[PDB]
Amino acid sequence: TTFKIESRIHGNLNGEKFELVGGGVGEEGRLEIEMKTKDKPLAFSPFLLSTCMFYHFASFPKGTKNIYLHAATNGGYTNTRKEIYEDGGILEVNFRYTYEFNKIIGDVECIGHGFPSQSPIFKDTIVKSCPTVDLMLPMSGNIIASSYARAFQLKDGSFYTAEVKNNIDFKNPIHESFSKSGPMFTHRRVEETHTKENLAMVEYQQVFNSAPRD
Amino acid sequence: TTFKIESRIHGNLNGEKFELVGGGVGEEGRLEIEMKTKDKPLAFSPFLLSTCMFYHFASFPKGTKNIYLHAATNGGYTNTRKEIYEDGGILEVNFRYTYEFNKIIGDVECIGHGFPSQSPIFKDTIVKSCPTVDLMLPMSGNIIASSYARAFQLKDGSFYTAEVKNNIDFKNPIHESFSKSGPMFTHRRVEETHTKENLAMVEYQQVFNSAPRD
Ligand SMILES: [Cl-]
E strand or H helix that includes residue B139: strand B132-139
**Phi-psi bin for A118: left (phi > 0), alpha (psi -120 to 50), beta?**
alpha
Backbone angles phi, psi at B123, to 5 degrees: -80, -15
**Distance (Å, whole) CA A136 – CA A77:** 15
> How crowded is residue A59: how many other Cβ atoms within 10 Å of its Cβ?
20
A39 C-beta neighbours (distance < 10 Å), count: 7
Q: If we measure between CA atoms, which residue out of A91, A31, A89, A75 comes closest to residue A169?
A: A75
Among A100, A60, A93, A57, smallest CA distance to A78 is for A93
* B181, B202, B213: best to mutate for the A interface, most A CBs within 10 A: B213
Query: Ligand 1 centre and the CA of B17: distance in Å?
Result: 4
The experimental technique used to determine this model is X-ray
* Per CATH, domain A1-214 is 2.40.155.10: yes
State the Cα–Cα distance between residues A50 and A90, nearest whole angstrom: 15
Non-local (6+) Cβ contacts of A176 within 8 A are none
CA of B145 to the centre of ligand 1 (A): 32
HSE, CB side, 13 Å, CA atoms: give it for residue A9: 26
DSSP secondary structure string for all residues of B92-134? EEEEEEEEETTEEEEEEEEEEE---TTSHHHHT-EEEEPPEEE
Q: Tell whether the torsion through CA atoms of B111, B113, B115 and B116 is positive or negative.
A: positive
Contact yes or no for A133/B185 (Cβ under 8 A)? yes
Listed residue (B20, B50, B54) closest to B121, CA to CA: B50
Backbone phi, psi, residue A42, to 5°? -65, 145
Resolution of this structure in Å = 2.3
**CA B55 – ligand 1 centroid, Å:** 30
Burial of A87 (0-12, 13-18, 19+ CB in 10 A): middle
Q: E strands along chain A, which residues?
A: 3-13, 16-27, 30-37, 58-59, 77-85, 90-100, 103-113, 126-129, 132-139, 143-154, 159-170, 184-194, 198-208
**Among B139, B149, B212, beta carbon nearest to A208:** B212
A189 contact residues in B (CB cutoff 8 A) = 211
A144, amino acid identity: I
Name the residue ranges covered by the structural domains of chain A.
1-214
User: What whole-number distance in Å separates Cα of residue A192 and Cα of residue A23?
Assistant: 15
